[PDB]
Amino acid sequence: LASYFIGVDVGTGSARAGVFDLQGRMVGQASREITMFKPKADFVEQSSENIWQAVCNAVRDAVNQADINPIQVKGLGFDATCSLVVLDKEGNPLTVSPSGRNEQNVIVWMDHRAITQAERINATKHPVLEFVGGVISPEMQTPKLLWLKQHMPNTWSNVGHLFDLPDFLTWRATKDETRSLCSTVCKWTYLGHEDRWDPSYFKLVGLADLLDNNAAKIGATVKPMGAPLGHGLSQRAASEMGLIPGTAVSVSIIDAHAGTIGILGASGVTGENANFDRRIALIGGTSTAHMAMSRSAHFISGIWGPYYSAILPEYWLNEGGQSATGALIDHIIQSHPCYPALLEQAKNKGETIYEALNYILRQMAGEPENIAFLTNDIHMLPYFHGNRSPRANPNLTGIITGLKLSTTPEDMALRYLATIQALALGTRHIIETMNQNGYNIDTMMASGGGTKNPIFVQEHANATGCAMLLPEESEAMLLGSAMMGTVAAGVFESLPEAMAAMSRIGKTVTPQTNKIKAYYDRKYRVFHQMYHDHMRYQALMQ
């Protein structure tokens, strides 16, 4: 009579499933890779049928690993990348691809075929663009829809359903076509605060046809996370997954936002739900999303949103990011000529490259409180792939100072430390921007890459002057999705309730001394000056 809940997370590379008990402890997990197709540059495609098979196999293996009965599984939640799934009028895969294969019916979030369409949309200056900083991205869905209407007219004539990936999953599981407020508000321009598609936008950009039949093709009904769909797991989906028909299924959510649910509510007050007002979520990895919520709407330069009820009801979401975080740290580490020799030594000692570099840093520092100061004369402007937040300029580039003609592991370690600090300083700039525009953030909840690196964590806390709180359960997106399942099943009455019950703080890392904090204040002055210097070089060259 003990109950379990499953979260499913469909990432770029794999579909993953986790089985959780009622206190949020993971008792089972499994993974299946999903196939990627890259027919030409900027084109990145997947197959919805391949993904669904991956999800079903992952779920079956996780339940088996958990060693529980299917009647014990009482709720499912699904999250995925914000990719685009195209189906015909019968619900079957319909090609989006130069290959013509109907199997290739998913335009992956990271596909950039629709750059031209995004530029056309942006030129209209339509009001709904104000929620994406006035500049729609080619990754978002409406540019992609316009691209398909233009370049794949036969597909366009035969469309029955245009799903954000998370919504495809819940539809495939339940037959219910209802869409999530998350995908639709964040990525499709749905006005969460007016509960509607804006027909003026769709007409203006040349997508007027999507609104026919009560907007059947894109979402006639749109609901909050935690709401149960259809009559639960369909007979078909239950047989495919090895579960019980009717098992509750929540409305879907985008992957990063699931991560946020997974961690943002882990309470610092015994026997209360968490206070969100002063927290930011850092969803780390190769890139990082910076997510906070307010009771009021704030349009913040360089940050996306405000998106109403995109995660929690009666909260407006603001979302910033850094495009290369783990990716930048790995670029700096892996490009250094000492890398291969140090990697080999690390592997042989059963450590990660980060643990090996951290060891070097500790040795160079003498005592640990001196680690931050090792970069007193070495600075980095981290915008190697532009800056997303708060500068919103994809054309910015990186700078590194303090370079010497030395190629030792010590030099590599210093460059890695400078990278961590630059990224932490960029996080400080995002938090500061939010705090000048409606927030009072003083605490960071973190998940994903970097959270198992003690120097990464500590220097984020030092640079921002905010505590970094690390989760008991590392699997934030699977856990957040499972929490949605509990709400859909009625076990908890609200997401904040589920979050408080199913996540907790595993470790609190506070900023250190005033000396260390003041050092970062000076580093931050350099961080800002480097941007102005960059702009000055550009001016001089003109």
Ligand X SMILES: O=C(CO)[C@H](O)[C@H](O)CO
Element (H, E) at 319: strand 316-322
Shortest gap between Cβ of 502 and ligand X (angstroms)? 22
Q: Cα(first)–Cα(last) distance of the chain, in Å?
A: 73
Count of chain residues binding a second copy (CB under 8 A): 27
| Residue listed under structure tokens 């949020």 | 24
- Distance in Å, CB of 69 to a second copy, minimum: 3
Instruction: Select the residue interacting with a second copy from 204, 216, 238, 364 (CB under 8 A).
Output: 238
**344 touching a second copy, by CB under 8 A:** yes
Q: Is 8 in the site for ligand X (CB under 6 A)?
A: no
* 65 part of the interface to a second copy, by CB under 8 A: yes
- The two tokens of residue 140 are 């978002």
According to the binding rule CB under 6 A, does residue 325 interact with ligand X?
Answer: no
Which uninterrupted H or E stretch holds 307? strand 304-308
Question: How many angstroms separate the Cα of 199 from the Cα of each of 145, 183, 308?
Answer: 15, 18, 19
Distance CA 167, CA 485 (A): 15
HSE toward the beta carbon, residue 10, CA cutoff 13 A = 37
Q: Which stretch binds a second copy (CB under 8 A): 61-69, 131-139, 251-259, 261-269?
A: 61-69
User: Please, which of residues 314-343 interact with a second copy by CB under 8 A?
Assistant: 340, 343
What number of chain residues touch ligand X (CB under 6 A)? 12
Residue 386 contacts which entry, a second copy, ligand X, none (Cβ below 5-8 A, type-dependent): none
Residue 350 binds what, of ligand X, a second copy, none (CB under 5 to 8 Å, by partner type)? Answer: a second copy
The residue within the footprint of a second copy, chosen from 213, 296, 348, 406 (CB under 8 A), is: 348
Residue for token digits 């007050």?
A: 269
Only segment of 196-204, 249-257, 374-382, 490-498 that touches ligand X (CB under 6 A): 249-257
CA distances from 346 to 55, 285, 453 (A): 35, 21, 15
Closest C-alpha among 325, 339, 335 to residue 453: 325
344-373: contacts with ligand X (CB under 6 A): none
Q: Tell me which of a second copy, ligand X, none is bound by residue 335, counting a contact when its beta carbon lies within the kind-specific cut-off of 5 to 8 angstroms.
A: none
Q: Rounded to the nearest whole angstrom, what is the least distance from the CB of residue 189 to a second copy in the complex?
A: 38
- Shortest separation between residue 388's beta carbon and ligand X, angstroms: 8
How far apart, in whole angstroms, are the C-alpha atoms of residue 355 and residue 358? 5
Q: Does 84 bind ligand X (CB under 6 A)?
A: no
Output 246 or 386, the one with its CB closest to a second copy.
246
Question: Going residue by residue from 208 to 237, which x/- string records binding to a second copy, judged by CB under 8 A?
Answer: ---------------------------x--
HSE-CB for 87 with a 13 A CA cutoff: 22
124 Cβ partners below 8 Å, 6+ apart?
A: 204, 205
By CB under 6 A, what part of segment 252-281 binds ligand X?
254-256
**392 neighbors 433 (Cβ within 8 angstroms):** no
245 vs 454 by CB, closer to a second copy = 245
Q: How far is the CB of 141 from ligand X (least distance, A)?
A: 11
User: Does 69 contact a second copy by CB under 8 A?
Assistant: yes
Q: Which does 347 bind (CB under 5 to 8 A by kind): a second copy, ligand X, none?
A: a second copy
Say how far apart CA 56 and CA 66 lie, in whole Å: 15
Helix (H, G, I), strand (E, B) or coil at 445: strand
Report which residue type is found at 532: H
* Alpha-carbon radius of gyration of the chain: 23
**Sites of contact with a second copy (CB under 8 A):** 29-33, 53, 57, 61, 65, 69-72, 235, 238-239, 242-245, 340, 343-344, 347-350
